[PDB]
Amino acid sequence: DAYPVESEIINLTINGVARGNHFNFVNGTLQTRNYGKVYVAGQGTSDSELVKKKGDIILTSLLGDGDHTLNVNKAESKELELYARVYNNTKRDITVDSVSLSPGLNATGREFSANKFVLYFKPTVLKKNRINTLVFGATFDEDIDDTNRHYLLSMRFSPGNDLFKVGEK
Amino acid sequence: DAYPVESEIINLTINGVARGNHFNFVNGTLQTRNYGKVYVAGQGTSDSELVKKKGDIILTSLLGDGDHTLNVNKAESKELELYARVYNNTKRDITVDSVSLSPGLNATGREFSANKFVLYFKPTVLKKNRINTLVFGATFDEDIDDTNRHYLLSMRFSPGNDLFKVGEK
Amino acid sequence: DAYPVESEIINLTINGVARGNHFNFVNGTLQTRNYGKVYVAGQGTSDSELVKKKGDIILTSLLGDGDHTLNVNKAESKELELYARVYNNTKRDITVDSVSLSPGLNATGREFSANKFVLYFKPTVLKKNRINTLVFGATFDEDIDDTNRHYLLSMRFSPGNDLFKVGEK
Numbered sequence: 001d002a003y004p005v006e007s008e009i010i011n012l013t014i015n016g017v018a019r020g021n022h023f024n025f026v027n028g029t030l031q032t033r034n035y036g037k038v039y040v041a042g043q044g045t046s047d048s049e050l051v052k053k054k055g056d057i058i059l060t061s062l063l064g065d066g067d068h069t070l071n072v073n074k075a076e077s078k079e080l081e082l083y084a085r086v087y088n089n090t091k092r093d094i095t096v097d098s099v100s101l102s103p104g105l106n107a108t109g110r111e112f113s114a115n116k117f118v119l120y121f122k123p124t125v126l127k128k129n130r131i132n133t134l135v136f137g138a139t140f141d142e143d144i145d146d147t148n149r150h151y152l153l154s155m156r157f158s159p160g161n162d163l164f165k166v167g168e169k
Numbered sequence: 170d171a172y173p174v175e176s177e178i179i180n181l182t183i184n185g186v187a188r189g190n191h192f193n194f195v196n197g198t199l200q201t202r203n204y205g206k207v208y209v210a211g212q213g214t215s216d217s218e219l220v221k222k223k224g225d226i227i228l229t230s231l232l233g234d235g236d237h238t239l240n241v242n243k244a245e246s247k248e249l250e251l252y253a254r255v256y257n258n259t260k261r262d263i264t265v266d267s268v269s270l271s272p273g274l275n276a277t278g279r280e281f282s283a284n285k286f287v288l289y290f291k292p293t294v295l296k297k298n299r300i301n302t303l304v305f306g307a308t309f310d311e312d313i314d315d316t317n318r319h320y321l322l323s324m325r326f327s328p329g330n331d332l333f334k335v336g337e338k
Numbered sequence: 339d340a341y342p343v344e345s346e347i348i349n350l351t352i353n354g355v356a357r358g359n360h361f362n363f364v365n366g367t368l369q370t371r372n373y374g375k376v377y378v379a380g381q382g383t384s385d386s387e388l389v390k391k392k393g394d395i396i397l398t399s400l401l402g403d404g405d406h407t408l409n410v411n412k413a414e415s416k417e418l419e420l421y422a423r424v425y426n427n428t429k430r431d432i433t434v435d436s437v438s439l440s441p442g443l444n445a446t447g448r449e450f451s452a453n454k455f456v457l458y459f460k461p462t463v464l465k466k467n468r469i470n471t472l473v474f475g476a477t478f479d480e481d482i483d484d485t486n487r488h489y490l491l492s493m494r495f496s497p498g499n500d501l502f503k504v505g506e507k
Contacts, residue, residue, distance in 0.1 A: 006175060006344060009266040009325060011292045012333055028336040033329060040336075071448045097347040098438060098492050100267060102290045110240045112289040114308040120450040121440045122490060123349045139452040152291060154267050156347060160371060164350055167366040167378075175344060178435040178494060180461045181502055197505040202498060209505075269436060271459045279409045281458040283477040321460060323436050 002036035002056045002090040007097070007158040010038060013104065014153045016144035017063060018077035023138070023151070025061045025084070035157055036090060047131050050087050057094075057126075058087035059134075070120075070137050077143045084134040088126040093161040096124045099136050104150035113148035116141045125161045171205035171225045171259040176266070176327040179207060182273065183322045185313035186232060187246035192307070192320070194230045194253070204326055205259060216300050219256050226263075226295075227256035228303075239289075239306050246312045253303040257295040262330040265293045268305050273319035282317035285310045294330045340374035340394045340428040345435070345496040348376060351442065352491045354482035355401060356415035361476070361489070363399045363422070373495055374428060385469050388425050395432075395464075396425035397472075408458075408475050415481045422472040426464040431499040434462045437474050442488035451486035454479045463499045 013026040030038040036056025041049070045060035062083045065074070072079040088094055099121045103112040120137035142148070182195040199207040205225025210218070214229035231252045234243070241248040257263055268290045272281040289306035311317070351364040368376040374394025379387070383398035400421045403412070410417040426432055437459045441450040458475035480486070 007346070008176070009327065011266065013335070026333075026335055028334050030333045031331045033327075033331070069448065070450075071446065097349065100269070100438070102288060104291070105289075108240065110238065112239075112287070112306060112308075114287040116285060116287055116454060118450070118452040118454055119440060120443075122442070137450060139450075158347065158371075162369045162371070164364075164368045165366050166351070166364055177345070178496065180435065182504070195502075195504055197503050199502045200500045202496075202500070269438070271457060273460070274458075277409065279407065281408075281456070281475060281477075283456040285454060285456055 002034070004034040004090060004092060004094065004157070004159045006034050007156060008032055008034045010155045010157055012040065012153045012155070014082070014151045016077070016080055016149035016151065018144055020063045020065065021072035021074055021077060021080050022063050022067070023061060023080055023082040024063060025059060029055065035094070047085065050085060050131060051089070056090050058089070060085050069135050077145065078140045080138050080140070080144060082134070082136050086126055086132045086134045088128050088130060088132060090128060092159055093128050094126040095158050095161060095163070096126065096134060097156040097158050098123070100154045101138065102152045103148070104152050106147065106150065115148055123163060125163070127161070171203070173203040173259060173261060173263065173326070173328045175203050176325060177201055177203045179324045179326055181209065181322045181324070183251070183320045185246070185249055185318035185320065187313055189232045189234065190241035190243055190246060190249050191232050191236070192230060192249055192251040193232060194228060198224065204263070216254065219254060219300060220258070225259050227258070229254050238304050246314065247309045249307050249309070249313060251303070251305050255295055255301045255303045257297050257299060257301060259297060261328055262297050263295040264327050264330060264332070265295065265303060266325040266327050267292070269323045270307065271321045272317070273321050275316065275319065284317055292332060294332070296330070340372070342372040342428060342430060342432065342495070342497045344372050345494060346370055346372045348493045348495055350378065350491045350493070352420070352489045354415070354418055354487035354489065356482055358401045358403065359410035359412055359415060359418050360401050360405070361399060361418055361420040362401060363397060367393065373432070385423065388423060388469060389427070394428050396427070398423050407473050415483065416478045418476050418478070418482060420472070420474050424464055424470045424472045426466050426468060426470060428466060430497055431466050432464040433496050433499060433501070434464065434472060435494040435496050436461070438492045439476065440490045441486070442490050444485065444488065453486055461501060463501070465499070
């Protein structure tokens with residue numbers, strides 16, 4: 001139903017998963033102003049289930065080996081990937097322009113992990129009426145475990161599908 | 170008077186303060202397109218003074234111990250917190266979606282501090298007709314002192330108060 | 339022809355250049371929704387050539403010594419600068435609010451450089467009917483060479499020229 005005409009930031013929660021070298025969504029919902037309802041399904045939701053969820057944009061993070069566009073070193077838990085399936089059921093193509101991460105607060109409620117990282121992200125078009133792959137990588141200084149796995153994810157959504165077209169050499 | 174309907178980036182200047190482990194605003198003003206006038210009062214402005222300033226959104230950074238939502242290691246000056254009071258006197262709730270930092274130029278005018286850091290920030294609603302607490306943390310590799318304390322702060326403002334609602338386990 | 343009234347993110351590709359300590363654009367074009375056509379000319383395009391290109395906003399990155407607002411250590415290739423000339427041929431002033439970088443994928447197509455960096459950027463007004471200097475710096479942990487030089491650049495454009503005005507001491 002939604003026909004977006006402006007950019008908007010989508011703020012979601014995610015956790016690192018050592019086994020599989022993945023990021024994993026926290027399930028829940030988010031009412032946006034321009035993109036309808038964002039529905040974050042449970043982990044590993046299949047494509048046929050994903051298109052039945054009650055929202056305008058449906059996301060699931062996938063776990064387990066093979067769900068990787070990136071060579072992570074599975075011998076450690078420093079190199080992590082979000083491998084997400086995103087159902088765009090709005091009336092327009094959406095570009096995910098950029099992402100950023102902040103660590104969440106740990107158990108104390110008053111400290112955050114200062115585990116430094118490099119973020120990998122390439123702008124990604126979410127075609128409408130389609131389930132799309134969406135990924136970002138993060139490579140940390142220190143292993144991700146249970147003490148330091150909590151992160152806050154910011155994604156910028158914008159209308160359309162226009163991307164840089166490389167010219168001649 | 171202002172009734173915002175689009176997101177906007179607010180660019181302000183801040184300095185690290187070793188004693189107290191804080192960030193501190195540079196006072197001044199900023200004319201925005203969608204959020205009226207931003208007024209950055211002097212440090213430690215009290216709540217009753219803050220609501221008398223001439224602007225649509227009034228900010229002050231607080232210094233001195235106790236003004237911390239975060240356990241900073243006061244034995245050093247690597248872990249810093251912005252503890253700000255923000256008066257939203259527009260006609261709508263505002264969400265601060267994200268922040269980012271850049272070091273400013275040092276005394277040479279041609280170099281910047283490459284002191285690496287991890288930024289902590291959780292999206293924060295600024296309720297209208299209310300003074301709100303706004304914080305972010307930064308944990309640096311190296312101590313902040315007089316040679317390397319100058320920073321540029323970017324905040325994204327957006328209309329409304331909608332946030333992620335966590336679902337069931 | 340373009341009269342922008344909203345902010346937009348511009349996603350471009352850039353490479354590090356060890357000799358000269360620069361970033362260098364990949365030439366090409368980008369259709370924006372609010373800022374007309376972005377035209378990225380070849381490196382070192384002169385000012386008289388730059389204003390003849392077919393676009394609404396024309397950019398070139400300059401190489402070679404002297405094209406630096408920043409003291410880079412030319413003895414190594416860790417400290418890099420984008421020194422760009424930008425022709426704003428829209429009907430309004432544009433502010434570049436912020437920038438961010440992501441490494442691109444390397445030759446494997448499945449790995450990215452985790453070379454950590456500190457980004458320097460100060461908000462910059464692109465005056466209309468003028469060629470403007472636009473710069474950002476990046477200081478890396480490790481030397482930039484042929485294995486790790488590929489980056490993705492995000493710039494946020496917004497209308498107008500309003501900037502923070504510093505108050506009295």
